[PDB]
Amino acid sequence: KEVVLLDFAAALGWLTHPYGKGWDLMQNIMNDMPIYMYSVCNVMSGDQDNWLRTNWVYRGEAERIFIELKFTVRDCNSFPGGASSCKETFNLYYAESDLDYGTNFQKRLFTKIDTIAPDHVKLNVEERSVGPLTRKGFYLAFQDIGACVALLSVRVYYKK
Amino acid sequence: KEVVLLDFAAALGWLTHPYGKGWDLMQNIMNDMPIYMYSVCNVMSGDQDNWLRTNWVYRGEAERIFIELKFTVRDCNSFPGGASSCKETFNLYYAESDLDYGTNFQKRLFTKIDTIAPDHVKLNVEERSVGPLTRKGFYLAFQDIGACVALLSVRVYYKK
Protein backbone atom coordinates (compact mmCIF):
# COMPACT_ATOMS: atom_id res chain seq x y z
CA LYS A 1 0.00 0.00 0.00
CA GLU A 2 1.49 3.36 -1.02
CA VAL A 3 0.92 6.03 1.57
CA VAL A 4 1.24 9.51 0.09
CA LEU A 5 3.22 12.06 2.09
CA LEU A 6 3.46 14.80 -0.53
CA ASP A 7 1.67 15.41 -3.81
CA PHE A 8 2.66 18.79 -5.27
CA ALA A 9 0.34 18.83 -8.26
CA ALA A 10 -2.65 18.18 -6.01
CA ALA A 11 -2.05 21.30 -3.80
CA LEU A 12 2.48 24.62 -0.59
CA GLY A 13 4.55 27.65 0.31
CA TRP A 14 7.76 26.32 -1.22
CA LEU A 15 10.93 28.27 -0.59
CA THR A 16 13.11 29.50 -3.43
CA HIS A 17 16.69 30.66 -2.78
CA PRO A 18 17.39 32.87 -4.67
CA TYR A 19 13.91 34.25 -4.93
CA GLY A 20 12.95 35.68 -8.30
CA LYS A 21 16.10 35.06 -10.31
CA GLY A 22 16.24 31.27 -9.56
CA TRP A 23 13.35 28.76 -9.62
CA ASP A 24 10.02 30.50 -10.44
CA LEU A 25 6.44 29.56 -9.59
CA MET A 26 4.35 29.27 -12.79
CA GLN A 27 0.64 29.37 -12.09
CA ASN A 28 -2.80 29.39 -13.60
CA ILE A 29 -5.10 30.71 -10.86
CA MET A 30 -7.75 31.98 -13.29
CA ASN A 31 -9.74 28.70 -13.58
CA ASP A 32 -11.90 26.46 -11.28
CA MET A 33 -8.84 24.66 -9.94
CA PRO A 34 -5.18 25.80 -9.86
CA ILE A 35 -2.24 24.54 -11.91
CA TYR A 36 1.15 25.21 -10.34
CA MET A 37 4.67 24.38 -11.58
CA TYR A 38 8.13 25.45 -10.59
CA SER A 39 10.58 26.06 -13.41
CA VAL A 40 14.05 27.45 -14.04
CA CYS A 41 15.89 28.38 -17.25
CA ASN A 42 19.13 30.27 -16.53
CA VAL A 43 21.01 28.49 -19.31
CA MET A 44 23.04 31.54 -20.37
CA SER A 45 24.42 33.01 -17.17
CA GLY A 46 26.94 30.53 -15.69
CA ASP A 47 27.58 29.48 -12.05
CA GLN A 48 23.93 28.72 -11.33
CA ASP A 49 23.09 27.41 -7.84
CA ASN A 50 19.29 27.78 -7.56
CA TRP A 51 17.40 25.98 -4.78
CA LEU A 52 13.76 24.98 -4.41
CA ARG A 53 12.74 23.53 -1.03
CA THR A 54 9.50 21.72 -0.21
CA ASN A 55 7.41 22.27 2.92
CA TRP A 56 8.31 20.21 5.94
CA VAL A 57 6.92 16.69 5.53
CA TYR A 58 6.08 14.41 8.46
CA ARG A 59 7.87 11.10 8.44
CA GLY A 60 5.19 9.24 10.44
CA GLU A 61 6.06 5.54 10.19
CA ALA A 62 7.98 5.80 6.87
CA GLU A 63 11.45 4.30 6.80
CA ARG A 64 12.22 4.35 3.05
CA ILE A 65 10.54 7.12 1.05
CA PHE A 66 10.07 7.01 -2.69
CA ILE A 67 10.26 10.22 -4.63
CA GLU A 68 8.61 10.43 -8.01
CA LEU A 69 9.43 13.39 -10.23
CA LYS A 70 7.79 14.39 -13.52
CA PHE A 71 9.42 17.15 -15.42
CA THR A 72 10.45 18.65 -18.73
CA VAL A 73 13.98 19.36 -19.87
CA ARG A 74 14.71 21.54 -22.89
CA ASP A 75 17.82 20.42 -24.78
CA CYS A 76 20.87 22.69 -24.56
CA ASN A 77 21.32 22.58 -28.34
CA SER A 78 17.97 24.30 -28.85
CA PHE A 79 19.27 27.67 -27.67
CA PRO A 80 20.60 29.63 -30.67
CA GLY A 81 24.29 30.70 -30.77
CA GLY A 82 25.42 28.19 -28.13
CA ALA A 83 24.53 27.94 -24.44
CA SER A 84 27.90 26.81 -23.19
CA SER A 85 26.87 26.75 -19.50
CA CYS A 86 23.56 25.00 -20.14
CA LYS A 87 22.99 21.68 -18.35
CA GLU A 88 20.31 19.00 -18.81
CA THR A 89 20.47 17.61 -15.28
CA PHE A 90 19.45 18.87 -11.87
CA ASN A 91 20.08 17.57 -8.36
CA LEU A 92 17.78 16.01 -5.77
CA TYR A 93 18.57 16.57 -2.04
CA TYR A 94 16.92 16.09 1.34
CA ALA A 95 17.30 16.92 5.02
CA GLU A 96 15.78 15.38 8.13
CA SER A 97 14.73 17.52 11.13
CA ASP A 98 12.72 17.08 14.35
CA LEU A 99 11.50 20.65 13.92
CA ASP A 100 10.16 23.05 11.33
CA TYR A 101 12.98 25.29 10.07
CA GLY A 102 10.43 27.79 8.72
CA THR A 103 11.97 29.99 6.01
CA ASN A 104 15.52 29.22 7.16
CA PHE A 105 17.53 27.39 4.57
CA GLN A 106 21.15 26.47 4.03
CA LYS A 107 22.14 24.26 1.20
CA ARG A 108 25.10 22.83 3.18
CA LEU A 109 22.64 21.19 5.62
CA PHE A 110 21.09 19.05 2.89
CA THR A 111 22.35 15.66 1.69
CA LYS A 112 22.39 14.73 -2.04
CA ILE A 113 20.14 11.85 -3.17
CA ASP A 114 21.08 11.83 -6.83
CA THR A 115 21.74 13.76 -10.00
CA ILE A 116 18.50 13.52 -12.01
CA ALA A 117 19.21 12.97 -15.74
CA PRO A 118 16.70 12.81 -18.61
CA ASP A 119 18.56 9.55 -19.42
CA HIS A 120 13.58 19.43 -27.89
CA VAL A 121 11.28 19.63 -24.91
CA LYS A 122 11.66 16.17 -23.38
CA LEU A 123 9.12 14.68 -20.93
CA ASN A 124 10.49 12.71 -17.99
CA VAL A 125 9.44 10.55 -15.09
CA GLU A 126 12.16 9.58 -12.61
CA GLU A 127 11.91 7.86 -9.26
CA ARG A 128 14.51 7.67 -6.45
CA SER A 129 14.29 6.50 -2.84
CA VAL A 130 16.13 7.16 0.41
CA GLY A 131 16.23 5.71 3.90
CA PRO A 132 16.33 4.78 6.63
CA LEU A 133 14.61 7.99 7.79
CA THR A 134 14.31 8.39 11.60
CA ARG A 135 13.34 12.00 12.55
CA LYS A 136 9.93 13.76 12.97
CA GLY A 137 10.10 15.13 9.45
CA PHE A 138 12.15 15.95 6.39
CA TYR A 139 12.41 18.43 3.51
CA LEU A 140 13.23 17.76 -0.11
CA ALA A 141 15.16 20.19 -2.19
CA PHE A 142 16.05 20.65 -5.83
CA GLN A 143 19.25 22.26 -6.91
CA ASP A 144 19.47 23.75 -10.36
CA ILE A 145 22.92 24.18 -11.86
CA GLY A 146 21.91 25.85 -15.14
CA ALA A 147 19.28 23.66 -16.83
CA CYS A 148 15.94 24.56 -18.45
CA VAL A 149 13.44 22.50 -16.50
CA ALA A 150 9.80 22.66 -15.41
CA LEU A 151 8.73 20.50 -12.45
CA LEU A 152 5.27 19.11 -13.21
CA SER A 153 4.70 16.64 -10.33
CA VAL A 154 6.51 15.73 -7.10
CA ARG A 155 5.00 12.77 -5.21
CA VAL A 156 6.53 11.29 -2.10
CA TYR A 157 5.16 8.02 -0.71
CA TYR A 158 6.31 5.01 1.35
CA LYS A 159 5.21 1.37 1.22
CA LYS A 160 3.26 0.03 4.20
CA LYS B 1 13.75 15.80 -43.81
CA GLU B 2 11.40 17.41 -41.27
CA VAL B 3 10.87 21.07 -41.92
CA VAL B 4 9.62 22.88 -38.83
CA LEU B 5 6.77 25.35 -39.29
CA LEU B 6 5.94 25.98 -35.64
CA ASP B 7 7.75 25.22 -32.40
CA PHE B 8 5.91 26.75 -29.44
CA ALA B 9 8.37 25.87 -26.70
CA ALA B 10 11.19 27.52 -28.65
CA ALA B 11 9.45 30.97 -28.86
CA LEU B 12 3.83 33.90 -30.15
CA GLY B 13 0.85 36.11 -29.44
CA TRP B 14 -1.64 33.25 -29.20
CA LEU B 15 -5.29 34.13 -28.96
CA THR B 16 -7.47 32.86 -26.13
CA HIS B 17 -11.27 33.01 -26.38
CA PRO B 18 -12.45 33.48 -23.67
CA TYR B 19 -9.56 35.50 -22.37
CA GLY B 20 -8.77 35.08 -18.69
CA LYS B 21 -11.37 32.52 -17.66
CA GLY B 22 -10.40 29.93 -20.36
CA TRP B 23 -6.88 28.84 -21.40
CA ASP B 24 -4.20 30.78 -19.45
CA LEU B 25 -0.60 31.62 -20.33
CA MET B 26 1.78 30.30 -17.63
CA GLN B 27 5.19 31.91 -17.80
CA ASN B 28 8.58 32.17 -16.21
CA ILE B 29 10.08 35.40 -17.56
CA MET B 30 12.43 35.89 -14.59
CA ASN B 31 15.36 33.80 -15.94
CA ASP B 32 17.88 33.97 -18.87
CA MET B 33 15.41 32.34 -21.26
CA PRO B 34 11.59 32.15 -21.05
CA ILE B 35 9.40 29.14 -20.32
CA TYR B 36 5.83 29.46 -21.57
CA MET B 37 2.88 27.05 -21.33
CA TYR B 38 -0.82 27.35 -21.90
CA SER B 39 -3.06 25.53 -19.45
CA VAL B 40 -6.72 25.20 -18.50
CA CYS B 41 -8.44 23.60 -15.49
CA ASN B 42 -12.16 24.47 -15.37
CA VAL B 43 -13.12 20.98 -14.20
CA MET B 44 -15.89 22.15 -11.85
CA SER B 45 -17.95 24.61 -13.84
CA GLY B 46 -19.70 22.70 -16.66
CA ASP B 47 -20.34 23.67 -20.33
CA GLN B 48 -16.71 24.60 -21.00
CA ASP B 49 -15.84 25.74 -24.54
CA ASN B 50 -12.39 27.36 -24.22
CA TRP B 51 -10.30 28.06 -27.33
CA LEU B 52 -6.59 28.61 -27.84
CA ARG B 53 -5.50 29.63 -31.35
CA THR B 54 -1.94 29.67 -32.71
CA ASN B 55 -0.43 32.45 -34.83
CA TRP B 56 -0.94 32.21 -38.54
CA VAL B 57 1.50 29.67 -39.99
CA TYR B 58 2.74 29.76 -43.59
CA ARG B 59 2.06 26.61 -45.55
CA GLY B 60 4.99 27.08 -47.97
CA GLU B 61 5.33 23.79 -49.86
CA ALA B 62 3.75 21.59 -47.14
CA GLU B 63 0.94 19.31 -48.22
CA ARG B 64 0.55 17.07 -45.15
CA ILE B 65 1.47 18.65 -41.81
CA PHE B 66 2.30 16.68 -38.71
CA ILE B 67 1.32 18.07 -35.37
CA GLU B 68 3.13 16.90 -32.28
CA LEU B 69 1.65 17.75 -28.90
CA LYS B 70 3.20 17.24 -25.45
CA PHE B 71 0.99 17.85 -22.52
CA THR B 72 -0.13 16.89 -19.04
CA VAL B 73 -3.59 15.74 -18.04
CA ARG B 74 -4.67 15.56 -14.40
CA ASP B 75 -7.09 12.70 -13.74
CA CYS B 76 -10.69 13.64 -12.97
CA ASN B 77 -10.73 11.36 -9.92
CA SER B 78 -8.04 13.46 -8.25
CA PHE B 79 -10.42 16.32 -7.51
CA PRO B 80 -12.01 15.80 -4.07
CA GLY B 81 -15.82 15.44 -3.76
CA GLY B 82 -16.37 14.57 -7.43
CA ALA B 83 -15.79 16.66 -10.56
CA SER B 84 -18.75 15.41 -12.54
CA SER B 85 -18.10 17.70 -15.55
CA CYS B 86 -14.37 17.01 -15.65
CA LYS B 87 -12.97 15.58 -18.90
CA GLU B 88 -9.56 14.07 -19.72
CA THR B 89 -9.62 14.86 -23.44
CA PHE B 90 -9.37 18.02 -25.49
CA ASN B 91 -9.89 18.72 -29.18
CA LEU B 92 -7.48 19.62 -31.98
CA TYR B 93 -8.75 21.85 -34.85
CA TYR B 94 -7.37 23.83 -37.77
CA ALA B 95 -8.33 26.36 -40.42
CA GLU B 96 -6.72 27.33 -43.71
CA SER B 97 -6.67 30.95 -44.95
CA ASP B 98 -4.94 32.99 -47.68
CA LEU B 99 -4.85 35.91 -45.25
CA ASP B 100 -4.08 36.79 -41.67
CA TYR B 101 -7.32 36.97 -39.66
CA GLY B 102 -5.56 38.98 -36.93
CA THR B 103 -7.44 38.74 -33.63
CA ASN B 104 -10.67 37.67 -35.34
CA PHE B 105 -11.76 34.20 -34.37
CA GLN B 106 -14.85 32.07 -34.76
CA LYS B 107 -14.82 28.50 -33.70
CA ARG B 108 -17.37 27.54 -36.41
CA LEU B 109 -14.76 28.36 -39.11
CA PHE B 110 -12.38 25.69 -37.85
CA THR B 111 -12.41 22.00 -38.81
CA LYS B 112 -11.80 19.24 -36.21
CA ILE B 113 -8.68 17.07 -36.63
CA ASP B 114 -9.21 14.77 -33.67
CA THR B 115 -10.13 14.34 -30.05
CA ILE B 116 -6.80 14.06 -28.20
CA ALA B 117 -6.95 11.38 -25.45
CA PRO B 118 -4.25 10.48 -22.91
CA ASP B 119 -4.93 6.92 -24.19
CA HIS B 120 -2.47 11.55 -11.28
CA VAL B 121 -0.64 14.03 -13.44
CA LYS B 122 -0.07 12.06 -16.63
CA LEU B 123 2.56 13.02 -19.24
CA ASN B 124 1.59 12.66 -22.89
CA VAL B 125 2.99 12.88 -26.39
CA GLU B 126 0.47 12.63 -29.25
CA GLU B 127 0.92 13.20 -32.95
CA ARG B 128 -1.74 13.78 -35.64
CA SER B 129 -1.51 14.89 -39.26
CA VAL B 130 -3.76 16.61 -41.79
CA GLY B 131 -3.74 17.35 -45.50
CA PRO B 132 -3.80 18.08 -48.29
CA LEU B 133 -3.28 21.75 -47.34
CA THR B 134 -3.49 24.22 -50.27
CA ARG B 135 -3.77 27.86 -49.01
CA LYS B 136 -1.14 30.51 -48.07
CA GLY B 137 -1.39 29.61 -44.41
CA PHE B 138 -3.29 27.95 -41.60
CA TYR B 139 -4.03 28.23 -37.88
CA LEU B 140 -4.25 25.48 -35.30
CA ALA B 141 -6.64 25.65 -32.43
CA PHE B 142 -7.28 23.74 -29.23
CA GLN B 143 -10.70 23.42 -27.75
CA ASP B 144 -11.05 22.63 -24.09
CA ILE B 145 -14.30 21.08 -22.94
CA GLY B 146 -13.55 20.91 -19.20
CA ALA B 147 -10.23 19.10 -18.74
CA CYS B 148 -7.19 19.96 -16.57
CA VAL B 149 -4.37 20.19 -19.09
CA ALA B 150 -1.08 22.03 -19.57
CA LEU B 151 0.32 22.29 -23.11
CA LEU B 152 4.10 21.87 -22.89
CA SER B 153 5.13 21.69 -26.59
CA VAL B 154 3.39 22.18 -29.95
CA ARG B 155 5.56 21.37 -32.99
CA VAL B 156 4.27 21.43 -36.54
CA TYR B 157 6.45 20.06 -39.34
CA TYR B 158 6.10 18.49 -42.81
CA LYS B 159 8.28 15.92 -44.58
CA LYS B 160 10.26 17.10 -47.60
Swiss-Prot record, chains A, B:
Eph LBD domain: residues covered: 2-160
Q: In which tissues is it expressed?
A: Expressed in brain and glioma tissue and glioma cell lines (at protein level). Expressed most highly in tissues that contain a high proportion of epithelial cells, e.g. skin, intestine, lung, and ovary.
What processing steps or modifications follow its translation?
Autophosphorylates. Phosphorylated on tyrosine upon binding and activation by EFNA1. These phosphorylated residues are critical for recruitment of VAV2 and VAV3 and PI3-kinase p85 subunit which transduce downstream signaling to activate RAC1 GTPase and cell migration.
**Where is the segment annotated Mediates interaction with CLDN4?**
1-160
Q: Assembly state and interactors?
A: Homodimer. Interacts with SLA. Interacts (phosphorylated form) with VAV2, VAV3 and PI3-kinase p85 subunit (PIK3R1, PIK3R2 or PIK3R3); critical for the EFNA1-induced activation of RAC1 which stimulates cell migration. Interacts with INPPL1; regulates activated EPHA2 endocytosis and degradation. Interacts (inactivated form) with PTK2/FAK1 and interacts (EFNA1 ligand-activated form) with PTPN11; regulates integrin-mediated adhesion. Interacts with ARHGEF16, DOCK4 and ELMO2; mediates ligand-independent activation of RAC1 which stimulates cell migration. (Microbial infection) Interacts with human herpes virus 8/HHV-8 glycoprotein L/gL and glycoprotein H/gH heterodimer; this interaction triggers EPHA2 phosphorylation and endocytosis, allowing virus entry.
Family, similarity comment: Belongs to the protein kinase superfamily. Tyr protein kinase family. Ephrin receptor subfamily.
Name under which the protein is recorded: Ephrin type-A receptor 2
Its organism's taxonomic lineage begins at: Eukaryota, Metazoa, Chordata, Craniata, Vertebrata
